[PDB]
Symmetry: D2
Subunit: 184 residues, 4 copies
């Protein structure tokens, strides 16, 4: 039976390593899994309750409905200052205020890429804490931290070339698929 995962990207720069990792997921997705990207978090305005009462920003509603109708979400993000990038958290913040709230009961897998060796590990646990509050089911195993990403995605092609990393993510995706089927 087919499944549909959507990806939420936490960096906005064109040469983003995390963007490259994210773009490789539809190509990597195992059989019975289709993966499409969500809109950019950059079209979102800063969360404000004054702006929310004037009406929810359109791209917020679009992402929410895309998340709600998907079987799982894969969040692919860098780590900024030992935590999650504000831009990404601002998106999570908009989604949390949406009714009904899209991440409740939603299987989610985390992927972080970094040039350093920690591979964005610190952000993941900060992100998990937020996701607890929204009642998402976040994949425990396996965890995907991609350190030393520069030697794993080639520049000017901005493609995830590393076969080992590619295989690793493909098995994470399978583990997320087992999770969404366990809760269905």
């Amino acid at each position: 039976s087919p499944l549909h995962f959507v990806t939420l990207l936490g960096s906005l720069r064109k040469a983003s390593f995390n963007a490259a990792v994210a773009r490789a997921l539809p190509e990597i997705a195992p059989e019975g899994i289709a993966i499409t990207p969500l809109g950019s978090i950059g079209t979102f305005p800063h969360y404000s309750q004054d702006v929310q009462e004037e009406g929810f920003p359109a791209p917020v509603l679009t992402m929410a409905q895309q998340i709600a109708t998907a079987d799982a979400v894969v969040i692919v993000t860098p780590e900024y200052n030992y935590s999650v990038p504000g831009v990404l958290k601002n998106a999570i913040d908009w989604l949390s205020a949406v009714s009904p709230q899209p991440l409740a009961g939603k299987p989610v897998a985390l992927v972080t890429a970094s040039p350093g060796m920690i591979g964005g590990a610190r952000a993941q646990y900060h992100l998990r804490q937020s996701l607890v509050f929204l009642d998402a089911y976040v994949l425990n195993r396996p965890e995907a931290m991609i350190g030393q990403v520069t030697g794993k995605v080639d520049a000017q092609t901005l493609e995830l070339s590393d076969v080992a990393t590619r295989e690793f993510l493909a098995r994470q995706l399978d583990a997320l698929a087992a999770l969404a089927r366990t809760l269905s």
Copy 2:
């Protein structure tokens, strides 16, 4: 000898309880301490490395220089989804990329206000982790979590009326003043 603290506000809505708490600090500041607000984090664009290379946004540079020349910073913010509001973290993110980086060696005190009983405690530790990376010296004691804030700031005047809360913050400010003098 006089001291100068600047305040960074984490909510953007007019009726923000945290804004009310922040506005009460110059009035509450003990003798030998002057407190001024910083610019809004809402004028900041989302952090992007592509935008940074085109030049630092003006209000980012203004806030950085205001932070660098101050004796301490007081961050007054709500808690969003068990963490720090993305908008605020986006600001921290911009400041981290500034050279020289304004929060290094900077005494900082945290204040959180919330209608619930936890009083924004969860955000504070997430924020502390980010501040470690930027080498800020964050006040350990006393901690300021204002739960049940609705009964402590009156509506339509948006003023921190609570005398007990006011006194508490005034002694926190004194504790931050002792910290900035210990490291000078």
Copy 3:
């Protein structure tokens, strides 16, 4: 279909409020749920790989199987120094080293109690980070933080008296029960 939960207690003192809360769970468990206590974490020696090479202590293996054969685990602990009590973390440390590891795939609900306003919340999230590594499924909703436990447990009888708190714990158990059934 009946279910069997086990409780893990994080405090060692006779007059523990968290213990009173734990003792109340068998009595509060809804229809179709039986809840039994685990052994004291106080019989465990400090974790050491040297003590492990010579063999797992009997009470560690006992707790491991009781956890394994149970449908869910309920952890009831105070908060020590903004984190989890070392003695309780020590028990978690012992269990994690057991093969096969008992908490893998194990539905878990957390309950924390404190005389303070925070109600042991800081401990719950630190504990959640450890439980991710052990691939346990920790109940996201509802969360049980019991603040001001002092006026919620009758003294000299050490019984959980607050009915509102009591019915609350029963709603969590039903949710934990729902989680265990979703993962079977």
Copy 4:
């Protein structure tokens, strides 16, 4: 002016890599710094308020005064289950209950070692949260995470061999020394 640091060790096994790292510190300490070990955390019984009412165990009071009279403390610990080892947290628990509490105002540097890529980083931040409550000053920079410690300690002699790692630890000590002098 001379300074005296004490080391707190988080592992109990004879062949501990973190122990080897701790043993190297007196030898690596720059001019004007003397570093002595504290007693084993393994002599401490599990924390209990009942065991405390009958009196603080002698080795807890011993560690407390050694910490008190020392200019700084260096904590060297592995990471257990994405957090701090229970046995080490247990020692922290005992110390926090001592009056006067030894870590108040105490300059502290953290060092963690792991065979893995993460180098015990997750433990450091959990530990930082506890240390905020105890009003210790934890060195922000530089941070010492020793990953792949296996190829950095000579086997059969259990000595810290990596010179790059060794000089690194000496740069932290100088920074810890600078912090202790800024707060005198």
